[PDB]
Amino acid sequence: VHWTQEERDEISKTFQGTDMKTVVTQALDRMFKVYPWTNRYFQFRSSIHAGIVVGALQDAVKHMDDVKTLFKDLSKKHADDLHVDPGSFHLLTDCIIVELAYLRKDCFTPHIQGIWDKFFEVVIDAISK
């Protein structure tokens, strides 16, 4: 998708310098309350599940230029197993972005938001069908 140098830096530097485990944890919590129907899919602890997810997103920055393949099976699970609706994936990442915005406040400019938006857009594409 073409990753501007600055873009790569921003993602990887965040997964290294920031506590993504608790960011994602809080994001799962937010999601479950804001978009109630998401609970249905999880019928387990958010704190524990967070590590798994951040773990997957981490391998994603490692293989940024090739997420679709690294997420091959990952999507299969979400589809023909848990049956998660493809149009619901953005609900989590959207919540991860809010948590990120609340932590960085002013530093989370429209421009930086766009970097993260771009990143989750490709993560959403990779993990959905």
Partner: protein
């Protein structure tokens, strides 16, 4: 919201639907099940085909509500109150499944109705989209 002309052609469709709610309803669900497998996850049925006994029974319940809904276009919010609390707070249906059923109901009508012009399509769509907006408005 709805114009006399729309209520009228909508009223002409509920008539057709009311004749055999089971047949129409079973076709809708079946189309939905075949095109969006993920929806099956909400119903524990042995047969997902139109021949299924639970599909037919449920299918008639669906169409019967859509028909009852047509008679209350002026007060859909209060009319669908319980049905919404059921699909929302109770069953936790992903709102993404609604438009999928709508199109299936729309496609089914395009198959039996002698005439399904852009005008009629538009009127039914408005009814369905209005019903769905209610069913996905009570998750708490």
């Amino acid at each position: 919201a709805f114009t006399a002309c729309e209520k009228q052609t909508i009223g002409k469709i509920a008539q057709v639907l009311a004749k055999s709610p089971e047949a129409y309803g079973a076709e809708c669900l079946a189309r939905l099940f075949v095109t969006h497998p993920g929806s099956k996850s909400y119903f524990e049925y042995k047969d997902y085909s139109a021949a299924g006994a639970k599909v037919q029974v449920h299918g008639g319940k669906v169409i019967r509500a859509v028909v009852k809904a047509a008679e209350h276009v002026d007060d859909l919010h209060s009319h669908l109150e319980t049905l919404a609390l059921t699909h929302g707070k109770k069953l936790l249906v992903d709102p993404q499944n609604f438009p999928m059923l709508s199109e299936c109901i729309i496609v089914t009508l395009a198959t039996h109705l002698t005439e399904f012009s852009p005008d009629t399509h538009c009127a039914v769509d408005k009814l369905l989209s209005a019903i769905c907006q209610e069913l996905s408005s009570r998750y708490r």
